């Protein structure tokens, strides 16, 4: 439970407030480069390596069997477990593009071949969606479940721009939470269907999720309409009663209020968390350790590593997960003048 500063050697002007990170087969991949890709890197996926406390970067590429991906800003990340038929992958949907339009198109990203000389190959199969498709929305969340015994996928959360009947060009950059109806995603066929329950009184954003054995638990978030930062930690239970995707849900009492989380698991189902903010002026500073089992989630607060003062009095901040109790955070670095490197990095780890 400690921190250590890093050094943005170069390639620093290519990391923006929001982004994503994916752990798979060792190498961790940055996603969401500011601005459209350059000829420096066509894809946008960067490989990151770190040695002696340096933050260096390398470009990646795809096969021909692959589609090319827009650099989405705040998507939803979901880990596909490695088993039949085509393991293993990571799923993205759908965020906002460098043009403020929105995807409504999930992608199925994988690794293909290596090295030979430590090099990596990936592919990106967009999975067309039949339904009842989800409408484009961001900040939301997705998760994977394996329910007796077929595997499928579940979506929740999200804001958007108002439907294009009161889409008002003075407010043309407003947001309002989409009506909170979960969607169910089968891989193939992509039989996307909407559902809901009365317990889903209202829908939130920026809420990290967590699932295991088709019983998912939702964490702290925020809702604009009521301006609250509710504590409504939720459980929901699903199962494939083919031919019926039966669902059940229930509120639970204890729920923390932490926005823009930073999730780095360590154990089989044990997650040490940072959390971006406590209240929309005052950020969160303390850590969090979360157990969970078939009895349920159980909370605990580990030790907070000693943030330097420079982060303590920041106006904002964010971060991402480097894996295995270790992760990467960032500061909007106020310098007079700008370096223009607006982001120092401190590294965090467990024990």
């Amino acid at each position: 439970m400690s921190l250590q500063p890093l050094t943005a050697v170069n390639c620093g002007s290519l990391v923006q407030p929001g982004f994503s990170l994916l752990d798979l087969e060792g190498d961790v991949y940055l996603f969401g480069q500011k601005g459209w890709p350059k000829r420096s890197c066509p894809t946008g996926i960067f490989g990151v390596r770190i040695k002696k406390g340096e933050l260096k970067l390398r470009a990646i590429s795809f096969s021909n069997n692959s589609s090319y991906l827009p650099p989405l800003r705040c998507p939803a990340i979901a880990h596909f477990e490695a088993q039949d038929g085509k393991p293993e992958c990571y799923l993205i949907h759908g965020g906002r593009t460098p043009n403020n339009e929105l995807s409504s198109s999930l992608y199925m990203l994988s690794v293909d071949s290596r090295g030979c000389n430590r090099k990596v190959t990936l592919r990106c199969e967009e999975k067309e969606l039949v339904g009842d498709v989800p409408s484009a929305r961001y900040g939301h969340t997705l998760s994977v479940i394996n329910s007796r015994g077929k595997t499928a996928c579940v979506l929740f959360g999200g804001r958007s721009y108002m439907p294009p009947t009161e889409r008002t060009t003075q407010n043309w950059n407003s947001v309002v939470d989409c009506p909170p109806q979960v969607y169910l995603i089968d891989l193939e066929f992509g039989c996307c269907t909407a559902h809901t329950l009365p317990e889903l009184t209202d829908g939130q954003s920026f809420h990290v999720a967590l699932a295991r054995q088709d019983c998912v638990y939702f964490l702290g978030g925020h809702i604009l309409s009521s301006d609250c930062r509710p504590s409504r930690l939720i459980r929901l239970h699903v199962e494939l009663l083919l031919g019926s995707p039966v669902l059940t849900c229930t509120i639970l009492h204890e729920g923390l209020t932490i926005t823009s989380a930073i999730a780095s698991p360590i154990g089989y189902h044990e997650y040490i968390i940072f959390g971006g903010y406590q209240s929309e002026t005052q950020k969160r500073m303390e850590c969090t350790y979360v157990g969970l089992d078939d009895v349920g989630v159980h909370m605990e607060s580990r030790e907070p590593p000693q943030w330097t003062s420079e982060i303590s009095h920041s106006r904002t901040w964010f971060g991402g997960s480097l894996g295995k109790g270790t992760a990467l955070v960032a500061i909007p670095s106020e310098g007079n003048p700008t370096p223009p490197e607006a982001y120092h990095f401190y590294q965090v780890s467990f024990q």
């Binding site: 407030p17 601005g35 890709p37 590429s61 021909n64 827009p70 800003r73 008002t168 003075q170 947001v175």
Partner: protein, 615 residues
Amino acid sequence: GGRPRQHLLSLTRRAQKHRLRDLKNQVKTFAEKEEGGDVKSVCLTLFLLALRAGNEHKQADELEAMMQGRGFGLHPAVCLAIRVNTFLSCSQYHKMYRTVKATSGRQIFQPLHTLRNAEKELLPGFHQFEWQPALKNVSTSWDVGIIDGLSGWTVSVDDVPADTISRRFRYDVALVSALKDLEEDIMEGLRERALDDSMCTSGFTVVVKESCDGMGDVSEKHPEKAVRFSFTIMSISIRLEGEDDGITIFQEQKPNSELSCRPLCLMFVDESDHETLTAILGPVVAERKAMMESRLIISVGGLLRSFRFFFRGTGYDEKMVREMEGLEASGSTYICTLCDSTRAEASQNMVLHSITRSHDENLERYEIWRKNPFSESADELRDRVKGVSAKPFMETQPTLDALHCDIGNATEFYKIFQDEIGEVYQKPNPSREERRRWRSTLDKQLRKKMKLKPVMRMNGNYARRLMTREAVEAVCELVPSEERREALLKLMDLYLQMKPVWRSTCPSRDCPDQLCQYSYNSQQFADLLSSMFKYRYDGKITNYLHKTLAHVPEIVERDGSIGAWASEGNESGNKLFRRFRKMNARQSKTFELEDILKHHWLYTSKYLQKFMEAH
């Protein structure tokens, strides 16, 4: 003896009448026989012509103004014009106003509050309108004034910051402001062209030119980067009702000069970051796309009349053009903006080209890229899709630049001279310092002949004093072979022949002889290049070469001018913006640009420049 003679202007009017009764009755009977007894006008003209005898024009002009009516007060309009036209800030006005006011007994200027009251007739938001059909996803108001640009970002911390600062109008209300201003000029076009009034209510078409440029690091002692997005009325023609392929009514006569480039949006952002730029410019794009379909109704001269539109998006430098269009930046393999050639397929064939580049097909290419329906390889995909990378967003007619239009051509002629000092086809492997030696001897040659001290980089003036048959002969003095001399003479002769064609304003009116003869001349040019100078352009070419040999005639046939769309004009208005900020600061950033835009848009209307007679 008698009474001594006294001066006539000291005696009372009785003695003046006594001594001048003779001339009084003489002028009386003279006026009776000559002008019908108009004694006052005749004695006025005589007093005047006697005043001009001693070259004393001034008091005679003053009294002439005291006659034929009076102009005691000043029209409030001209007065607001005089506050703005000189950057006088508010309190400065009020001070000079109090001064002159209680100086001499008459309200020569108008005071503040009435100035501002009369002014509110000139900003956006003062002339109601319908819209046929009603607009697609557009607000309904018509008095909405200066909207903040942020466009309702919930100030929430979570997401991308909302710290960006911006102020603008709604495009439509800006257009209606400019037009309702220009009522005088459109009615002048009507009186000149001898066209009916009850039969001129529908067939209008206004061409409106967009433009956006970065503006760096506003210098103030005490908030640096800036972007300014503006438009300009270009022409308005008739379309009723027969064939009438086109009958212009009001053609702008100083197209680029910043006196006509009405600012519409301003944002303390950087030219670079695609993100926040789009995040604001969206609404503008939505309006633009949404507007071009419908038609517009407006009362002018009591008769509500119709207006259509077409848009010519031109005013950008190449970086911005790649950005909005989605192509790489910049020294890419897809060097052009209208063809698809690499360097090489422009090297083998230079001018035998065709313009095809278009917006919706760029959208198409982008979709193709994203899906990759042919699952080909990376560089395979790039080449098969013609270098499109990113979903573009704003239609821009990607026209050639007029401002530089030479500087590549300049430096190219410069290098060519430096190489014809050398012998490249005998020593095709020059070294580091020999090229410098040759450059220096060339420059000293020119310095001795044409008084052009050496340089590091090519401004305009340098090039213009360069491209002279005179400087051609002077540099020819240095190249040894009697043969290649006349060759490059033919070269620069053709280039001189073609320059004005593209820096023109209306060659269809200015000098059409070269325009009609152009294409063949460009052909002879490319022939001379490939035949006598292939040593250098085997596979690589300069950017501007593609344009200048490619489509100039095709572009003019597409439009009919080049300079009449160059944003070079907007590059002036930066001087305005910066000074305005220096002299009408509020100053908090929230209202800073508020007043900046208010005063600026005031500065840029016809209505007031018409009161800038100086006649």
